[PDB]
Write a protein that binds this ligand. Sequence first.
Ligand SMILES: [Co+2]
Ligand SMILES: [Co+2]
Ligand SMILES: [Co+2]
Ligand SMILES: [Co+2]
Lengths: 324, 324
Amino acid sequence: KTVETVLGPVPVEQLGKTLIHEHFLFGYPGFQGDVTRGTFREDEALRVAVEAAEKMKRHGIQTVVDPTPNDCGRNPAFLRRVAEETGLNIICATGYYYEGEGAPPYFQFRRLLGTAEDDIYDMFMAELTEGIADTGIKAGVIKLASSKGRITEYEKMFFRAAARAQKETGAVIITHTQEGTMGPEQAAYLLEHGADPKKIVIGHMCGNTDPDYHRKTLAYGVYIAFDRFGIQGMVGAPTDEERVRTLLALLRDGYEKQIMLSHDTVNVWLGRPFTLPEPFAEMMKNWHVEHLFVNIIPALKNEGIRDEVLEQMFIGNPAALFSA
Amino acid sequence: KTVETVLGPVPVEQLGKTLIHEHFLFGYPGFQGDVTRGTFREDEALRVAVEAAEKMKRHGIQTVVDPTPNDCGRNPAFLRRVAEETGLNIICATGYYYEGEGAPPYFQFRRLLGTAEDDIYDMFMAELTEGIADTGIKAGVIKLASSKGRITEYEKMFFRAAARAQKETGAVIITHTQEGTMGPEQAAYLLEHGADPKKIVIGHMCGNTDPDYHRKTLAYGVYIAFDRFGIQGMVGAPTDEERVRTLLALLRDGYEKQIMLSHDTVNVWLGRPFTLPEPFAEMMKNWHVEHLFVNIIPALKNEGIRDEVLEQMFIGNPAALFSA
Ligand SMILES: [Co+2]
Ligand SMILES: [Co+2]
Ligand SMILES: [Co+2]
Ligand SMILES: [Co+2]
């Protein structure tokens, strides 16, 4: 009846309204080597993170799942400070980014050793049941990801180690799909290996606009997430208008008990500060933590979606996902 | 007339006997993510490092160039403690590992901002002239690497930045080639952007056993390095007899003034402990900082290599390399 948060175990019944996918801190693998010009200003980072946490607060959010991979700047101790200034429940993860957006050299080396899959499994088990580093914080979800048109050999070891730690701990698995691909494959692959569909969230399902692709993924009984609201202009990548008509199609079909929404914001960028160019700039202007409440839900309500359905998505599904 | 070490500038005429490529500490990108089961045992790390530094001194070594890339665990402060404890000059680098076992997502992203090269260049300048992070320690060389059979467009970004930074600072450039390829290509591309051949060392040249490939590279006037003595069986690598055979053919042609030697050891692995398989463990038995001196040099001498030549490689070349 409890889930591990950055402030310890919390009874599921108390999660309330939650965002399944947001990042307080995030850096692309490699950000670490640019420490000289992209130094981490820990108090400025906290200001902006707490700010993002209070904004979520003002729309009723009580819980955020921050699935930042281990190789992407994950900082449990930091998240713990944010949860203190705001009271927000923050669940973190254990996992690595996908081959294209991560740091594979390390586990690619353990492959030569023939212990990779088993080392990953040991890392998941240790972070889910003992603590991350010396922080005392346990991850509450296992984060997985696969590339553009396939689940690579490197990525499959993570999925197999994940199914194994889930059988052993019953932890929730949340994934990321690259550019609208592999949703069904991921669910099939995980289930084929003993994972419980009711503890799986296939993410970035909004990256694809064919409701049919979603119905295939949903047929496995797993949850899915439209978690990139606000992100547009990746040159051919879905727009919020497309996200909504796809969402509305699935809700009108009766799939509300399997759907969750988020924005996938990066509130504090690790590494050297930048600025997007005028083109992408505009398109991404609604990429912030209030976009769902201020823009998306109103558009959903104006299309006939009832409050009970919204509450099933933001409250009942997370509650259900983190228990059983 | 000085070069930056981990303890400040040191007159080039005081470097004496130098190992051009050794790693006190090293981690393949992604090791950071495995911190829970692979924390950094400092005091023990410094102890192993110091013994290694002691074993080098024992053989007359006064200076070691530790080119650990930014994304591979480079730690100037830690290197500074090894130097203080041993009196050994330690020169570090600024640079990223090759795209095969480096951490490309971060700077790959900055390419989309259209600022990568200038960013990398600003990173090189800062670390070469101002300091690494808040260490006050400056890098003494720019570290570059290319992939197997190619210098990818991500890698060329760094090469262009290095030549630019070299023209501005006169800093030495040390490179790594992957599996005996691209030596001549690296030299040509660097020379094409204004880098100076007398301040370039093409590394892992011993990864190719064709003395012609070597002559092709040496014709550019750059230095080359047989820097992996002791490593055999791993990375589809040649053997030390193959290295010695190739080395002797070049020494007999009169190339002693463009050749340097090292072992490319990793005295303290970052991340989680391991132990090589039985097949390799056996082949890598001589991979330690005393091998050149205990096994290789005698063999070379028992081949007629006189002490004046060996002194040129170990003393005269590093002295010429680092000074104008
Ligand atoms: Co993702
Ligand atoms: Co994300
Ligand atoms: Co190398
Ligand atoms: Co090396």
